């Protein structure tokens, strides 16, 4: 129920099970060591996890082997990318650095 690093296929499958079938409030944060804007978004996501403590944000490094195919099977076109889930279905897909949309969605969905 905070920021959770996802490094393996198993961990991602479990996280998506919680977000979809499990209907738990879940955000997927796709990042990379080479992502410039993620350098100031990652801290923002940490502070937001304290504001919305029941949400789980799964932080995904797209360069990670093991989840190598999950990424290509997700059509990730840019880092950062954020996927928002509530009630078991996707409520948002913020592609690129847009913290306004991130904050608007966190409040609208998980307040």
Numbering used by the authors: 3 to 113
Sentences from the paper on this structure:
TRXo1 and TRXo2 share high levels of sequence identity and similarity (74% and 97%, respectively) and their crystal structures are quite similar and overlay well (RMSD of 0.9 Å).
TRXo1 crystallized in the orthorhombic space group P212121 whereas TRXo2 crystallized in the hexagonal system and belonged to space group P65. Well-diffracting crystals of TRXo1 and TRXo2 were obtained with one molecule per asymmetric unit (a.s.u) with Matthews’s coefficient (Vm) values of 2.3 Å3 Da−l and 2.0 Å3 Da−l corresponding to solvent contents of 46% and 40%, respectively. Their structures were determined by molecular replacement at high resolution of 1.80 and 1.50 Å, respectively. In both protein structures, almost all residues were well defined in the electron density map, except the first two residues (Met1 and Glu2) of TRXo1, which were disordered (amino acid numbering refers to the mature protein without its mitochondrial presequence). The distances between Cys37 and Cys40 Sγ atoms are 2.03 and 2.05 Å in TRXo1 and TRXo2, respectively. They represent the typical length of disulfide bonds, suggesting that both TRXo isoforms were crystallized in an oxidized form. The region containing Trp36-Phe42 residues including the WCGPC signature in TRXo1 has a different conformation to that in TRXo2 and is shifted by approximately 1.9 Å. The NH1 guanidinium nitrogen of Arg41 is hydrogen-bonded to the carbonyl oxygen of Ser74 (2.85 Å) in TRXo1 and to the carbonyl oxygen of Ala12 (3.50 Å) in TRXo2. On another note, the fully refined TRXo1 structure contains 130 water molecules whereas the TRXo2 structure includes 92 water molecules, of which 51 have equivalent positions in TRXo1. Even though TRXo1 was crystallized at pH 7.5 whereas TRXo2 was crystallized at pH 5.6, which may explain differences in the solvation shell, TRXo2 would be more positively charged than TRXo1 in a pH range between 5 and 10. With a pH value of 8.1 ± 0.2 for the mitochondrial matrix of A. thaliana, the global charge of TRXo1 and TRXo2 in vivo should be quite different with values of −1 and +2, respectively.
